[PDB]
């Protein structure tokens, strides 16, 4: 299946899924065809004039006939659905063919659990069957916390908020009264009862939101998405009680995410604290075999695995995670 472009008024780097290419002002680019019909997809944009953010549209070719059109008024490329079937079918070799599937089956592995109908609940815009995301969009969680922490109320567009599941480790939702220490140190209740059983119903829906967070983080450099992705990883790793199939499936999921992550975005994406905790101290520190290996390979510096530089300039304060030593008896050389 096929997404035509009406034209290409302005110079822009275009991405589809994990692919990318440049289009020049008024290049005769008439879109993309032979798009693999199975998956969700994302077609995204960064204008050569460095003034723009990254933006994009998630869609599913099975849900309709979709095409891209520049809107000079708004100054961006817009997805649209061709309502009139015959009208579309009318709308040669500058229609480029989507590539043959790599040996990895990379995109499926990144989007295995991602579903358009799930996307559409996180990005809320009813009139459309495709979903618009960009770099600047905040989360419903952040928007809530703001007003919580806090004349003209005049709303923000709800479609410009990412309605990710609210995950907050220091919340009443996460911590049962009378089980404060238990629930904070072992997040199994929050994961299994509140999240998996309560909200997501199953591990497929969990993984979908996790995979979608990641990809919005990667494609758009969206802050709330990188946060959500880390928080959903940390929630599993911080639970002593997790279904076996989730742990095995997570290892693979993360492996592919870290494999596909371009070096040049890793700084911004990866959270040093979360990755060190999950891998080396959490309940699930032994459980992510393949992810540990690829991370230690691509990003040792992040994990303190860069195996030794000279103290230049030549202090100590007392330690919280030991007892306070009142006194002692010490046998030793004088």
């Amino acid at each position: 299946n096929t997404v035509p472009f009406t034209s290409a008024p302005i110079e822009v780097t275009i991405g589809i899924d994990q692919y990318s290419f440049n289009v020049k002002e008024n290049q005769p680019f008439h879109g993309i065809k032979d798009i693999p019909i199975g998956h969700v997809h994302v077609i995204h944009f960064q204008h050569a004039d460095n003034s723009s953010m990254r933006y994009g549209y998630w869609f599913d070719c099975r849900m309709g006939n979709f095409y891209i059109q520049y809107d000079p008024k708004d100054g961006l490329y817009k997805m649209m659905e061709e309502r009139d079937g015959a009208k579309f079918e009318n709308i040669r070799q500058m229609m480029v063919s989507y590539p043959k599937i790599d040996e990895d089956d990379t995109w499926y592995n990144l989007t295995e659990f991602v579903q358009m109908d799930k996307i559409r609940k996180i990005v809320r815009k009813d009139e459309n069957q495709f979903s618009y995301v960009d770099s600047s969009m905040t989360t419903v969680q952040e928007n809530e916390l703001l007003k919580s922490s806090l004349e003209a109320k005049n709303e923000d567009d709800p479609a410009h908020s990412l309605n990710y599941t609210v995950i907050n480790f220091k919340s009443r939702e996460a911590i049962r009264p009378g089980h404060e220490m238990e629930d904070f140190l072992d997040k199994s209740y929050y994961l299994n009862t509140v999240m998996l059983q309560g909200i997501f119903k199953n591990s497929s829906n969990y993984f979908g939101e996790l995979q979608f967070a990641f990809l919005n983080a990667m494609f758009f450099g969206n802050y709330g998405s990188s946060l959500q992705w880390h928080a959903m990883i940390e929630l599993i790793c911080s639970s002593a009680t997790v279904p076996k199939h989730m742990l095995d499936k997570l290892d693979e999921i993360l492996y592919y995410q870290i494999k596909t992550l371009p070096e040049q975005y890793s700084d911004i994406l990866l959270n040093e604290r979360v990755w060190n905790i999950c891998l080396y101290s959490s309940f699930q520190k032994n459980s992510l075999h393949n992810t540990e290996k690829i991370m230690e390979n691509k990003y040792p510096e992040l994990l303190g695995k860069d195996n030794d530089d000279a103290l230049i300039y030549g202090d100590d304060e007392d330690d919280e995670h030991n007892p306070t030593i009142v006194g002692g008896l010490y046998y030793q050389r004088p």
Binding site: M137, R172, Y223, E272, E301, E320, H321, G327, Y331, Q332
Partner: protein, 1407 residues
């Protein structure tokens, strides 16, 4: 070979090294050295790999079980002759367990061989000196050779330098075993030769090592140097080797001879071998030279005069300065080498003309040349000056004390290339900017700290340094932007890491441009600027490393001086029967090589047994793949030989100080006013570095040709700088720019509506604006419009803070406000200039529609957190807008959001920390509690000599304090809380959190805190979690180090804690009733001062509080009822105490007022002090060494030690006899059952004890052995003092010599117990030297006393015997005391030193 060694070793009477005995005195120490060396490798690294960890765990086991390991090891030396295979990569990995026996053997051999003088003075490296110092010694030694520079009679000097080719590689094992058996036990020999004869695995091939030393074995150094000695002996012959070494009963120092005639008796004046590099300095008279040459030319004719061809010379020197190839000198050089080469079988080593340099000094050759340890050296004698200031050594004739020669130094070509490849390697890697900087730094420092003054003379190296530094910069720049910058601020490179810079160290000429030296500060009263043009000082360069490292010459001259001084000071102290105190050397501590500081390190008595330590460090290259670049110095032996702290200080200052540096960063954007030093071998991620420095990197002076404005903001981007756009997008997410604008305008509207009347305002209208208006950067419109009741008389336009307006400018009835936001960069962020220009531009705009000719443009720079305003004012308006902007800038919640997101992006890190800055709020009306959890989980510790640590928990408490009211909620945590629980240090935090939230619950809404401030950061999560039902209570951390932990030094608090038998809440006012007379603020400063003192020196602080016993503590109080006048004194005393103790630790005297956090017989003083002695019992150190079951073990009951210390004195020695008996069926275990307090007259450094008490009449005294005596002292010694010996002998010489001396070093904080036996020589000297009062005296020897084995135990208890009169302390009854007295005794309770029985009565006030 071997014939030479036999003749040599017999000539030396060499005493073969035995197999290590079962009870080898040092075996212990030898083992720790070996294992410490083995661990060392893991000191650096945090996350271990598997085998790294597995290896480490092996060593620790070995360490944790010493004597087992010793017996394993000696077993394998005795019997093991087949071994695991060795992996190589050349670096050798040897089976971890083998390495233990091997490193143990290494140490044993080097120690014993050093003791036995196996290796003569010429063999290097020597523990004696670092390599640069060898080179120096060698050049001085040459200069000091008798007549060496004389060419009157056609003399010649010849310096031959070459390599013993393949020395290690051709070692023959059968020969090696034979050789070893001359010097070591034959079983050690067999071990050694067998251990070389093992399988080596490389790639896929393995092969049995048939010959060749394996350099990676830990004792390879020993072999290599022993073998080298064989070759030295061939080169030198027995006689000359004997001249050089000196007689084995009186050996020569390196290069020294017994007389001048022996020096001159042989042409070989000097010899040295550094591993496989030999140096030979010959001297010839004209005849001997020609003789030798003719003999050579006979074998090897050179008719055509070709001998200059292929004659190695030193290219690093100018042509005139290198050796001149004059035919006579060239033939002498070749003849000397020919002679030398002939002396050594090629089966031992390959000596080739091609790898030799032969420098000839003569009437035709004024320079003597050599290369050593990386240095090219050229000696020019003054007399030859006719024949000059960089990298030069002055060579002084020791006899005339005149400078007779200069040594010129350069860094060798080889070492220049090595450094060049290190830098090229950095650039050529797989990295964070900081990591690249840190590698540059390591390489630079490694180069400079070694080669020092040689560098400045080496122009090709200066060039490489400069080019290398530029390439490091260029790498950072290319990472920052394809485009590459017009110019670049040096602040980003050379600012230290603590301030977020790369902390590069420079070796280059770098201008700091004046334009980079501007900074500004916003105050309440206005904006202050600094620019370079304002001062008349020097133009600023980045400091370079050149001038921060003391030259080797100055180190060495100063070392000679401070070590002579030390010897002299030590002599002088010994002359007064004293030991030299370290305080007398304070001031030469960081001088000397070794550093004088080494004399007083704790590990010193053990390092004494670490021999071969230099070569051992150098050979690590063969057995570890990554080693320190500082392979040539060892800080345990050498001390620290550089210190670059002044560099950091100077770079900061040159860059314009903190203030200037931070103006280049996003620091002001965070909304912090003051620097405090808090970001986090850890790197700054490139993203973060980029963001932090963005104001100075992302500006038009750095990048041009690509200027755009970022959608949804007014931020400009001056190129595609990696990561920055996204960082900034994230910061301003969800239309924050527009929201800040709207939010600020809303605030101003609110304020205006509160002033309708006061300012005759009719109405205030909030305009509605285009969506993007807040970030239309080239036109504007009004945001607020304002209607006059009647009329306004307004000024012509002026700035917000200009003070002197004239309101005669215009009449108006409509005033507008335009709130402008900008995001400034380093080039342009002057908000005053900006708002004036924008106002004057926009108001004469034909596109900005303002609704009247009169109004005010307000401006806020979001990047620099500064503001101003310009336009028309009427009376009252300017001060209102002043106050309003002051409050808006602090409080606006959208600005708050901006600053948090900036702080997040920078990983600064959240409720606001408590701070000096906001400290004062503690005393507003907002109710607040401090929580300190430090004393919640407390233990006492038992550590045995092994390393086993048992803790036991004692009662603790939660310290929760209202700093405004002084109310202290002290929750007692009884030990039962911990019973059966695990992970106690984590549980402690949650238990604290639970107990605090319960306290808050128990208070009525009235009194519930608004904030809880936790002293320790690990309390944050647990308390936030436990306070979820109280969302309006903020939990705050603090950076302040508050001294609440010292609360348990307040007796009345200790007492209730220690007495509690269940959980309990006790309420206190920690301010007593101070608030009747003083403020909360003042009470808290006083509390904090008092607790700081108690924390810093409990004893002194409690002395201060206890001085006047007339001033008491009310029953419902914690502190004494001082007057105001007395509190002033007390306070000042504690200020002093703190800083005394601070100068007594950091060595400082008196400095800048920045702040932090009748006569005779005053026995009364010491009597109060003595009531504090019990505190010292909290840390008890017992002198201990490896259990020997052959020896007695003496067991002192805890209860007797307790009582002994309680009754003792802070200054005066107190003594008693100990009695006991061997346990049942345990002859070796001698239990102390009774202490006998005996009449005595004590002194500071001694005690007159009366004689062995006759106690035969008392019951239970059947059985009781006299065991010896026990006493306090105030000096810490590793031996029995001369005075102890004198006293011990007097007591025991004629009666029971096996009596021990238990000496207790009593000091604030602790007691240290040492038990000793006294030798018969000990006893002899004591007889000769009666009534000795000093630590030393003529004849005295530490070795008079030997370590006795002492245990404490609380399983047994003792009792006391006392004089029947109860009195024992005769200080105040001297005349009544008779030391030869025959006293009587009874069981009882010894009075304390200054009990009333012992001292003058004190008149009190008839209550």
């Amino acid at each position: 070979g071997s014939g030479v060694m036999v003749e040599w070793l017999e000539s030396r009477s060499f005493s073969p090294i035995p197999f290590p005995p079962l009870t080898y005195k040092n075996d212990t120490k030898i083992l720790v050295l070996a294992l410490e060396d083995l661990k060392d490798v893991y000191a650096s690294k945090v996350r271990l790999n598997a085998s790294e960890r597995e290896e480490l765990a092996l060593i620790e086991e070995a360490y944790d079980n010493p004597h087992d390991t010793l017996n394993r090891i000696k077993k394998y030396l005795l019997t093991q002759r087949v071994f695991k295979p060795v992996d190589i990569t050349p670096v050798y990995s040897v089976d971890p367990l083998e390495k233990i026996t091997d490193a143990y053997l290494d140490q044993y051999l080097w120690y014993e061989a050093d003791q036995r003088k196996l290796f003569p003075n010429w063999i290097k490296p020597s523990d004696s000196e670092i390599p640069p110092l060898l080179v120096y010694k060698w050049t001085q030694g040459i200069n000091n050779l008798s007549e060496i520079w004389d060419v009157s009679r056609g003399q010649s000097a010849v310096l031959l330098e070459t390599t013993l080719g393949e020395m290690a590689e051709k070692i023959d094992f059968t020969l090696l075993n034979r050789l070893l058996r001359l010097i070591v036990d034959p079983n050690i020999a067999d071990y050694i030769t067998a251990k070389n004869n093992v399988v080596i695995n490389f790639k896929d091939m393995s092969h049995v090592n048939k010959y060749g030393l394996i350099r990676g074995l830990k004792f390879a150094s020993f072999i290599f140097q022993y073998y080298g000695l064989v070759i030295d002996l061939l080169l030198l012959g027995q006689e000359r080797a004997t001249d050089l070494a000196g007689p084995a009963n009186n050996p020569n120092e390196f290069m020294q001879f017994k007389s001048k005639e022996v020096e001159k008796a042989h042409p070989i004046r000097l010899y040295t071998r550094y591993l496989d590099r030999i140096y030979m300095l010959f001297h010839f008279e004209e005849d001997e030279g020609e003789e030798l040459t003719d003999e050579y030319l006979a074998e090897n004719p050179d008719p055509n005069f070709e001998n200059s061809i292929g004659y190695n010379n030193r290219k690093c020197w100018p042509k005139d300065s290198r050796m001149r190839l004059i035919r006579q000198d060239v033939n002498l050089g070749r003849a000397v080498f020919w002679e030398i080469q002939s002396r050594v079988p090629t089966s031992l080593t390959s000596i080739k003309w091609e790898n030799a340099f032969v420098s000839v000094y003569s009437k035709n050759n004024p320079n003597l040349l050599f290369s050593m340890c990386g240095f090219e050296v050229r000696i020019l004698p003054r007399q030859r000056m006719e024949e000059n200031d960089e990298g030069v050594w002055d060579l002084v004739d020791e006899r005339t004390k005149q400078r007779t020669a200069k040594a010129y130094l350069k860094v060798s070509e080889e070492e220049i290339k090595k450094f060049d490849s290190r830098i090229r390697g950095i650039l050529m890697a797989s990295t964070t900017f900081t990591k690249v900087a840190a590698k540059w730094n390591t390489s630079l420092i490694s180069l400079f700290t070694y080669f020092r003054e040689a560098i400045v003379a080496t122009e090709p190296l200066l060039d490489i340094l400069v080019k290398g530094e530029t390439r490091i910069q260029n790498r950072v720049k290319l990472g920052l932007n394809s485009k590459m910058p017009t110019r670049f601020p040096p602040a980003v490179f050379y600012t230290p890491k603590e301030l977020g810079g790369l902390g590069m160290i420079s070796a280059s000429h770098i201008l700091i441009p004046a334009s980079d030296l501007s900074w500004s500060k916003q105050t309440d009263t206005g904006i202050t600027h600094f620019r370079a043009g304002m001062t008349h000082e020097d133009e600023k360069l980045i400091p370079t490393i050149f001038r921060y490292i003391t030259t080797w010459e100055n180190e060495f001259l100063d070392s000679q001086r401070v070590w002579a001084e030390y010897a002299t000071k030590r002599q002088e102290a010994i002359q007064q029967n004293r030991r030299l105190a370290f305080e007398e050397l304070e001031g030469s501590w960081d001088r000397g090589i070794p550093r004088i500081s080494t004399l007083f390190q704790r590990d010193r008595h053990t390092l004494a047994y670490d021999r071969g330590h230099r070569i051992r460090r150098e050979f690590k290259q063969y057995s570890l793949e990554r080693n320190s670049p500082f392979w040539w110095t060892n800080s345990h032996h050498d001390g620290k030989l550089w210190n670059l702290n002044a560099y950091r200080t100077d770079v900061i200052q040159a860059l314009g100080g903190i203030e200037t540096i931070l103006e280049h960063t996003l620091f002001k954007g965070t909304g912090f006013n003051s620097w405090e030093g808090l970001f986090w071998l850890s790197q700054i991620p490139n993203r973060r570095f980029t963001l932090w420095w963005s104001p100075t990197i992302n500006r038009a002076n750095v990048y041009v040709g690509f200027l755009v404005q970022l959608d949804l903001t007014g931020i400009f981007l001056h190129g595609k700088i990696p990561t920055l756009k996204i960082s900034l997008i994230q910061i301003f997410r969800a239309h924050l720019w527009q929201k800040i604008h709207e939010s600020i305008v809303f605030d101003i509207c609110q304020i205006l509506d509160g002033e309708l009347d006061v300012l005759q305002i009719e109405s205030v209208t909030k305009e509605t604006v285009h969506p993007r208006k807040s970030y239309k950067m080239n036109s504007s419109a009004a945001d607020i419009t304002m209607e006059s009741v009647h009329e306004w008389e307004v000024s012509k336009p002026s700035l917000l803070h200009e003070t002197n307006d004239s309101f005669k400018g215009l009449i108006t009835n409509k005033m507008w406000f335009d709130v402008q936001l900008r995001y400034g960069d380093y080039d342009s962020h002057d908000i005053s200039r900006y708002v004036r220009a924008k106002f004057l531009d926009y108001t004469t705009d034909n596109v900005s529609m303002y609704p009247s000719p009169t109004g005010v443009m307000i401006g806020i720079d979001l990047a620099y957190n500064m503001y101003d305003a310009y336009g028309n004012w009427f009376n009252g308006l300017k001060p209102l807008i002043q106050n309003s902007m002051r409050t808006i800038m602090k409080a606006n919640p959208a600005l708050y959001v901006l600053r948090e997101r900036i702080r997040k992006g920078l990983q600064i890190y959240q409720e606001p920390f408590l701070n000096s800055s906001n400290y004062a709020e503690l005393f507003n009306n907002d109710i607040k509690l401090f929580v300190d959890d430090t004393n919640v989980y407390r233990v006492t510790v038992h550590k045995t000599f092994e390393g086993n640590v048992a803790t036991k928990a004692i009662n603790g408490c939660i310290f929760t304090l209202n700093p405004k009211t002084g109310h202290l909620f002290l929750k007692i945590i009884h030990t039962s809380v911990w019973a059966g629980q695990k992970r106690l240090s984590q549980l402690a935090k949650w238990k604290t959190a639970e107990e605090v939230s319960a306290l808050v619950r128990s208070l009525p809404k009235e009194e519930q805190p608004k904030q809880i401030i936790v002293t320790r950061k690990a309390m944050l999560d647990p308390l936030e979690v436990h306070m979820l039902d109280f969302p309006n209570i903020a939990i705050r951390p603090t950076e302040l180090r508050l001294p609440f932990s010292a609360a348990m030094s307040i007796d009345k608090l200790s007492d209730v804690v220690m007495k509690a038998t269940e959980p309990q809440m006790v309420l206190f006012n920690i301010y007593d009733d101070w608030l009747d007379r003083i403020s909360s603020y003042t009470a808290f400063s006083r509390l904090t001062l008092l607790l700081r003192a108690l924390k810093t020196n409990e004893e002194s602080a409690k002395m201060i509080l206890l001085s006047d016993p007339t001033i008491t503590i009310k029953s419902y109080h914690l502190w004494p009822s001082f007057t105001d006048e007395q509190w002033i004194t007390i306070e000042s005393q504690m200020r002093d105490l703190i800083l005394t103790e601070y100068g007594r630790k950091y060595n400082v005297n008196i400095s800048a007022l920045t702040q932090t956090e009748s006569s005779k017989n005053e026995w009364r003083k010491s009597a109060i002090a003595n009531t504090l002695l019990y505190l010292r019992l909290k840390n008890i150190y017992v002198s201990a060494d490896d259990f020997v079951e052959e020896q007695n073990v003496y067991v002192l009951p805890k209860n007797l030690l307790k009582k002994f210390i309680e009754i003792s004195d802070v200054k005066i020695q107190v003594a008693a006899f100990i009695y006991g008996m061997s346990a049942k069926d345990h002859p070796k275990v001698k239990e102390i059952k009774t202490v006998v307090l005996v009449p005595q007259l004590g002194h500071v450094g001694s005690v007159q004890i009366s004689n062995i008490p006759d106690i035969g009449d008392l019951p239970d005294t059947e059985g009781l052995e006299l065991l010896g005596w026990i006493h306090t002292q105030t000096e810490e010694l590793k031996f029995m003092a001369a005075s102890e010996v004198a006293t011990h002998s007097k007591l025991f010489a004629d009666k029971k010599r096996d009596c021990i001396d238990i000496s207790i070093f009593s000091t604030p904080g602790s007691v240290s117990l040492s038990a000793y036996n006294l030798t018969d020589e000990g006893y002899q000297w004591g007889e000769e030297n009666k009534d000795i009062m000093n630590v030393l005296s003529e004849g005295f020897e530490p070795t008079f006393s030997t370590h006795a084995q002492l245990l404490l135990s609380d399983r047994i208890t003792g009792n006391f015997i006392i004089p029947s009169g109860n009195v024992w302390n005769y200080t105040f009854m001297g005349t009544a005391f008779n030391q030869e007295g025959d006293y009587n005794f009874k069981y009882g309770i010894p009075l304390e030193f200054y009990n009333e029985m012992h001292r003058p009565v004190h008149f009190l006030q008839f209550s």
